Each structure stands twice: as C-alpha cells, then as structure tokens.
Design a protein around this ligand. Structure first.
Ligand SMILES: Cc1nnc2[nH]nc(N)c2c1C
Length: 127
C-alpha cells in the first residue's frame, strides 16, 4: 500500500546523447500527449496512497509515467529514442494490465496511445 521510490531520472554515470530523434520525442511526442485533456492521470508517478490503490505496486513492477519521461527528456537521461519509446509503452501497458477493459483510465491511455503511435510513425530519420 506504500509508494516505492520513483523510477530513476538522474544518473551521472549513465552515458547520454542529445539527438534529433530524442529532440522529437520531447518537442513533438511528449508535448502532444502532455497538453491533451486526458494527460492528467499520467503526469506523475501513480500515488497509490492518494488514489487508494493498495495493490498497484504489488502488480506493477516497472512503473512509468509522463512526469518521469518529461524529466528524463529535459535532463538528457537517454542514450537513444528506443529507450524513451519503451518508457511510453511501459506506461500504457501498466495501465492496461492494472485496470479493467473500458475503464475511464484505460480509454484515456488508449487516446494518448493513438496520438503516440501517429507521432512515432513519423519519427525523423537519424541525422
Ligand atoms: C496511471 C493510473 N493507472 N491506473 C489507475 N487506476 N486508477 C487510477 N487512479 C490510476 C492511474 C492514475
């Protein structure tokens, strides 16, 4: 029923890059999903105490959220775009695992994922 430590967003010994694909993941992908009317449940780690989800972290062992992704992008945490794309997919999958089909949070994730997929289809060529 307690919250775990959040996912890592800082690690000075992890090697980093600033690349056109990662810039697209911030400027297009994250910004598109973040401004959406359904973003709010996904803008920070799941707070199992506040939201009365005492079993969430019993079930979800690889937590992820757009607040974490935003910090990772803004603080140049990544080496490559695949790492960030995986974080988005982990976030959506966790929601689909934890919740019932057609629940409001699942419809919200699905709408964000539809936009995500459209933007990833247009991921720029690596320069
Ligand atoms: C991301 C997330 N996923 N599953 C959920 N179930 N109920 C919630 N409040 C909730 C949230 C915020």
């Amino acid at each position: 029923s307690m919250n775990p430590p959040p996912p890592e967003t800082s690690n000075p010994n992890k090697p980093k890059r600033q690349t056109n694909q990662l810039q697209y993941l911030l400027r297009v992908v994250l910004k598109t999903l973040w401004k959406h009317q359904f973003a709010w449940p996904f803008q920070q780690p799941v707070d199992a105490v506040k939201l009365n989800l005492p079993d969430y972290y019993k079930i979800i062992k690889t937590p992820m959220d757009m607040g974490t992704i935003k910090k990772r992008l803004e603080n140049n945490y990544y080496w490559n775009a695949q790492e960030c794309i995986q974080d988005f997919n982990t976030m959506f999958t966790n929601c689909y695992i934890y919740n019932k089909p057609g629940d409001d949070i699942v419809l919200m994730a699905e709408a964000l994922e539809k936009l995500f997929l459209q933007k990833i289809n247009e991921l720029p060529t690596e320069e």
